[PDB]
Amino acid sequence: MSREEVESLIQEVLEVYPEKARKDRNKHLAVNDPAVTQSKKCIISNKKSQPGLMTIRGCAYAGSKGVVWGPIKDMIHISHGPVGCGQYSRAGRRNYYIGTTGVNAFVTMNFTSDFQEKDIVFGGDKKLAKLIDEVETLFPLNKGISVQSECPIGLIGDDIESVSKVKGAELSKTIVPVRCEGFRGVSQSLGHHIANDAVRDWVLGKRDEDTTFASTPYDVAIIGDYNIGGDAWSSRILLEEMGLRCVAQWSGDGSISEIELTPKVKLNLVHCYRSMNYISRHMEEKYGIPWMEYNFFGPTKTIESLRAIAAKFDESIQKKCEEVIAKYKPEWEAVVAKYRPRLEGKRVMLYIGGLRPRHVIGAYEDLGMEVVGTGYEFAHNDDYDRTMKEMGDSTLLYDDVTGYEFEEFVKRIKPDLIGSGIKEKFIFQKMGIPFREMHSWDYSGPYHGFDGFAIFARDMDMTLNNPCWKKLQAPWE
């Protein structure tokens, strides 16, 4: 509110930085004007972080192994390198799946080459081949192997592509080498791009000549939904209620056969544009499959997306969509009637990764809650182009915010609720401000769809209005 004070706050916050750091950071903070369609004139993104400023961004390995390849349940993913990277990323992301872990599913397990000094000095391609043999011996029901490279693999002269080719020819198994070394790029976005390229080059085209799959005019594939807390499932039950058939979902609860069957669908429904736009566009160019973005956060966005998707098919699909909307109307109406009075008028600040900082605005507004500030760790300029129209006037936008910047912004704006990751949760809890984890749903959820909206509203109500926030000050002080 009152744009000039927001600019004054930005200047006051930037006053502490050195000249180079302040010049760089001035470009990544902006005041929203909804009429602006080109975000390059106000905010800059997808650049390197300033050293020593305590950024929140991850690495390309997190973007590829932790986000894209990890949810694939029937595949075994080898963290090629030292032990740390696979260990810190093991089961940290709630990409839900159905399977028997250790036999035919391996999502929550940590496979690594566990590099030692001799591996660094002399390379680890022979170790990689021996590891692949051991994996084949001890996990016979796996349907594929991916090799996710960590930093030393890129640094030393290792050639994992030739090893993957030789071993895949020898054992007749799909082995996908991913060069997702953490020093590449500036964030997880390059990891997304590298993982998409690997999927395109090694997995997607296996069934190009296969025509044994029976296709229907209602074949769609969910792209960029990773089943956080079951989110994708909560989406799927709606799409099948509309009369459509979901052949595949990428990549939460996903199987390699689903990915290989994806080029046979009629329509691609992309939830996370940021992480899967590469493969969606490639599929459009090569197979002629149209793709479209949708939003299932909140009843309004869900209804709009359902109608837009139904508009792509015949009359029966549209009638079924209307039936689904009518069936689910009373439930979310009751949820709103129960929870909006306790949440109306509250102000929220968000700082999340590439998609959610703009996707969940509608759900908050459905509860009578208003977003004062939003930002991204690693989004590109098109994400901000969408965000500027999705956000309100004179609100704050921040790209790759530092801990000091975010703390100062929160201290001045004083929001009622903050949605961010685990690395700000306790910082802002000690400040006396309710916090919701917007990556893992605070180990709750799902939040997608009509079923997820009730859980979302309940969680926001339970955290915002908890009595604990009234007891931070001692009565004698």
Place this chain on the structure above:
Amino acid sequence: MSREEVESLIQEVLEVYPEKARKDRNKHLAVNDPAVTQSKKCIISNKKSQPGLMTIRGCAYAGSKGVVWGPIKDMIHISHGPVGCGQYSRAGRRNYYIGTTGVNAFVTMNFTSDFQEKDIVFGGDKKLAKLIDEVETLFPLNKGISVQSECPIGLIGDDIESVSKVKGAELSKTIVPVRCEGFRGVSQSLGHHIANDAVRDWVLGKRDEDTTFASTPYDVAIIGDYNIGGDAWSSRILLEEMGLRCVAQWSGDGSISEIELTPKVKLNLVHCYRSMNYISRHMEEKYGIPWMEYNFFGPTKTIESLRAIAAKFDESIQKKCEEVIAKYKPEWEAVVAKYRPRLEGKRVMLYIGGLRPRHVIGAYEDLGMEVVGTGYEFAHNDDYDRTMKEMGDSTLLYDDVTGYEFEEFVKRIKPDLIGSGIKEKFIFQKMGIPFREMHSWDYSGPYHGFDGFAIFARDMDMTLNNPCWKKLQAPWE
């Protein structure tokens, strides 16, 4: 050995008492002489305790409600009076049973009249009748009710016999009034006697005119085994393997129908003479049923008892007895070979209620383990007559020993292990002497029979040779 210093120790322990207390307590301590079969001239028992000397004895309510009537699973036992007595005795004794608690079994439950001031002043007969009405309403599958009197019932002049008669006639239900007030007698022994008299007067003769029960020449009834940790089951399996049919079990895991069928058996096998000799003699006089005492503590006593019992029947029973002994010989021989080298030579001091201080001696001697001191809370002089020949020469015998007396005796004798109740366990553990609970088997067992002997030996070894007993002295002290 060394009787002289034992008498010197007795005098030294006694010198601190007042004159009357010392004169009384001198009669209850003795030095064993195995040639003596008349223990009256050597020890005095079954007398009231000296006031203010911290005795271990209980009351008649504990002897009747807690010991005899309580194990009967299909009956409901009302602790008539104030709330304390049944609450302290609820599920404190491990008389095991099979049933659905609260529906057809009620052992671990506490039923009480919860006397208030108005009940004390104006009596509780009408309250007792209303309680019986409510018990019938809320527990329809109960097969009988007993009313165990507490001290104010006997003190205020409540006539529970008339109420029991009227309500039993009205409901066609067995209601047994037991005048087991705690001020009667000097210990639990009078509780045993009163409970046996109640069983005789109200329960035993109910099927005297009924002859529908098919009888066999091999019918026996276990009397005085309360299934402490499954002891009675481990005895019954041996009895059934030998070829006898066990009709009744008094009273652990017992049912009122079994008690009613008891006068139809051919032999009574009495384990606890102290608590059940009254009913055994009554059954022998009225129905002509012979009874015999047996011991299933340790392999030697078990084999002797099995042979003696088989001697009461035909040749097939004796053949089956030999078969059972031969079958079970290797198991207890292996137990002996495993545990006797770890326990040989250790000296034990015992103090239990009325049967076990002399019954468990054989099992201890089976492991090369010597009993140097034994005593009873409430035994009679016949129990001491039986005990005199089972103890070693110049061993200490104590009746109704005080806490100070037992502490001084243990301090001087310094036994390697003590077997007593919960009220001495921690006292002697803090002095650094291993302790075994010989009432509840330290929540272990069973100890009866061949199966129980292994558990007994394992428990003695695990407590005697525990490393914790070598750490009581700090290295710097």
Place this chain on the structure above:
Amino acid sequence: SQQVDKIKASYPLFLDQDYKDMLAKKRDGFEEKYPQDKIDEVFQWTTTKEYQELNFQREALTVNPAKACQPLGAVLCALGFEKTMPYVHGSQGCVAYFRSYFNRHFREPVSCVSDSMTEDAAVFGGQQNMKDGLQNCKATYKPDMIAVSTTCMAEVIGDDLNAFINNSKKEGFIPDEFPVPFAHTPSFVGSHVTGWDNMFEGIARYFTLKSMDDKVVGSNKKINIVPGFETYLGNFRVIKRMLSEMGVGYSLLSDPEEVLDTPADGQFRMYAGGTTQEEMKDAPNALNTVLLQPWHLEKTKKFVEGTWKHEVPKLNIPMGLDWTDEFLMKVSEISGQPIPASLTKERGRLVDMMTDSHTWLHGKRFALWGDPDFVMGLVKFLLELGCEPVHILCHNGNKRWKKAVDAILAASPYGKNATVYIGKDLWHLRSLVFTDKPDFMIGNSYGKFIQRDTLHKGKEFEVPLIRIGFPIFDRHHLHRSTTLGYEGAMQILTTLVNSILERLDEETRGMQATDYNHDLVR
């Protein structure tokens, strides 16, 4: 049969096929057991609301009570004084039961004596028993003080404790200077906490009633602390520690903390620590007296206000966050000492843990029982955490306490679905948790059977038990815990949140069925 390398105790020895066949033969032959279908039908009926309506119509029958009799509390109070022997005038079976109860809960020696009254005393009274017992106890166990309570037998007979002790003193059975306080503790009135109150009032009246001429309020610059019936050593320890941090001179009366936690170093100690007679005599010189558990210390409050002329503060039990703050500020006001920074940091850490666990704690439904002060403090703490108390049971509660608890519940939106029950036993609570199922129970060990019953209806109907209170018999060393102050609140919150997480982990351990929610991070 037994294998010498793997010896089986009763469980699972009696699950062997031979024992199973033996038990089946026994039941089929001589038990005359009801058919299993009838048993299942009766159990299902007992789980219904009609059975609950019949159950709550009880007037004469008590099933599984949640209280004890007065002399148990009297003995617990007597154990809190230095070199003091608890002496119960009456029957010895009561003393045996008291000692067994306290031994099982504390896993420690408990010393108490009886004068062993019999039918002869039922006819002529127990004056001779009193004289002989006092002489014998003093000669044998050498106490500095003998604190006398009564059993129901002596109360019904009508023995005069004062006259008996005076006649013992006059005839030379005990010295005239030997302190023998006494209290009448009838078992048909109140409960164990009432006995604690009566014994403490008797001791205080013995030591202070006739020496008030030279007493000036506030002379010794201390504050008296009366804890009441207390079975957690950590509570005594935390009260003393908090008062020491504030730099406040204090005198804790009836401190049994030392004698219930003696070390195992090779010697037995009958007596250890405890409030001295000098402290009891100097108590009227204190600035004020604070009662930690006011709802069972009413007679003590009346004596302290009417004789010591102390203005006893209106303070709740220092449990949870708000009431601990109120206790701290009241103590600061009385003593004049400011609250130190360390206690403020401890409170902040408690608030931090509350913020950390609020998401898992929110909305959970609880059925709790215990003593009045502990129950109301626990309800207050649950309301502070956003939890929902549903069934609040207090067998030894009264109507004024119920009104106070209802007032507490009305002040919180989370107390909307809560009902307070006084005079009800654990069978009532079993009906309540079958008909209105909560998420958890909080109570003593007796609740375990209830859990069993719930599990018999189904895994989806099972109500897990959380062991907080007295007595706890099936777990070891829980009596060392703390429930008062910020430390007690921390321990209680940790126990609750980890019980919730353990239940969640158990329900999501089914592979390929429910393990999709078996998250590493919670």
Place this chain on the structure above:
Amino acid sequence: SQQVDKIKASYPLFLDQDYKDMLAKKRDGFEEKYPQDKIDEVFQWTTTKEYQELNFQREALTVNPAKACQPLGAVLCALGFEKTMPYVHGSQGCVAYFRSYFNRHFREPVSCVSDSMTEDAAVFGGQQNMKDGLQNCKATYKPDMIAVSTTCMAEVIGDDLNAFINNSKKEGFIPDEFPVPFAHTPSFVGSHVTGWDNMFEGIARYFTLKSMDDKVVGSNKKINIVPGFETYLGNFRVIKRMLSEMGVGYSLLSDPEEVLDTPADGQFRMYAGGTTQEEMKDAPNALNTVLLQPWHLEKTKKFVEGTWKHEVPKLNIPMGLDWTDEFLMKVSEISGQPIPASLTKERGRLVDMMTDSHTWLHGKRFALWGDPDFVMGLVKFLLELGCEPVHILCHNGNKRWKKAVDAILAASPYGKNATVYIGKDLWHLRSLVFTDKPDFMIGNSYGKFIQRDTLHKGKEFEVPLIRIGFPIFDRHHLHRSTTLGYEGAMQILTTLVNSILERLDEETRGMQATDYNHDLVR
């Protein structure tokens, strides 16, 4: 579907019939899943001894490790100093993962910065990154000290930390007097404890190497304490408390307890407590230095003996009765202070608890894992309790430590059936607990999955997990516990005995089947 009154999260919402049908259709239509009988056969095969033989032949594949990389330990060490910023020279993903790991374990803010080296630095080095990062960190977060560790990227490209920091000081990016200690922490060498050791050695060398001329051993009359990689705040607290009771002057180096336990009172504190620079400078003047975890403080020991000339005692970790006694006696001998009576009483109380719980503790079989010092202390305490360790796993252990643990096992008859494994991961331990079933596991949160696998074989084959170690993610506030000293031994004993009792209660809750052994008193 959702009901507004009773909203269901993922569990048990996805157990609804419509979701079940949807998942069945998805699997049967597009997943191309193996038949369930094949899955059962493969799982049963993985539970066999032949599969264990195949599993232990692994030489190039690691499955579910139980260790981390050095910079995590370096960051934990750096966090223990006053107003010190951990600074990791390398890539930012490492710092993100470190902060997330420590946030999930401690539930507290973790401060750590990186210079965000990218593909450009992969051929030029990170000198400019170091200069700009040091300037930015000092300007923004205002630390009194910056402690620099390295990621594997800078280790492989071989960046020279000393030259980079000297050049940063030379060109005026940060002041010449600003303390900037550094250490190389390669992730492909050792584990996180090695990183802790390297960071502590670097800091000590920075503060004491060049000013040893004026130092005199024993002049300040204090004892230096180096705790090592420690994730229990109660351990620091108990070490301080025990040293304070003895009246022994001490200096705890790298003390992070305050910064990891800040209160929630309306403000965020980035720094709190910690070892001061003056204490580090004055450390060589102490009488001696005591290393709490000697098996990962070898380089620190070498520096302290070689340079400070302190005669470092050969002490084990102060875990369990005997090693706590030895630590106390050595401290008393060094400082000349007698051991006070309070510690003797605490030891006696621990012995009393051991005597009380020995019957349930005896003969139980445990598979345990963690760090070397913690693992060997736990093994020693288990042997003291009469328990049998069977599978002892230490992923980051070495052959000398294995020899020491074997010597410890050989001195007790309860260690007869124990095998020690070094370099093995949790898949090996899963095979071991399937083929040689213990009664319980002791380890971190990663053990939970193993428990699930055992429950998939059957309820009779399930091995419950007991959460002691690092990290613990699925329970709240267990990081406040204690494992050192008599208090830690008491806590561990209580946890073990009560876990055994809960397992027994669960096994005997079946009505009319196993509830004959559902004892109220245990």
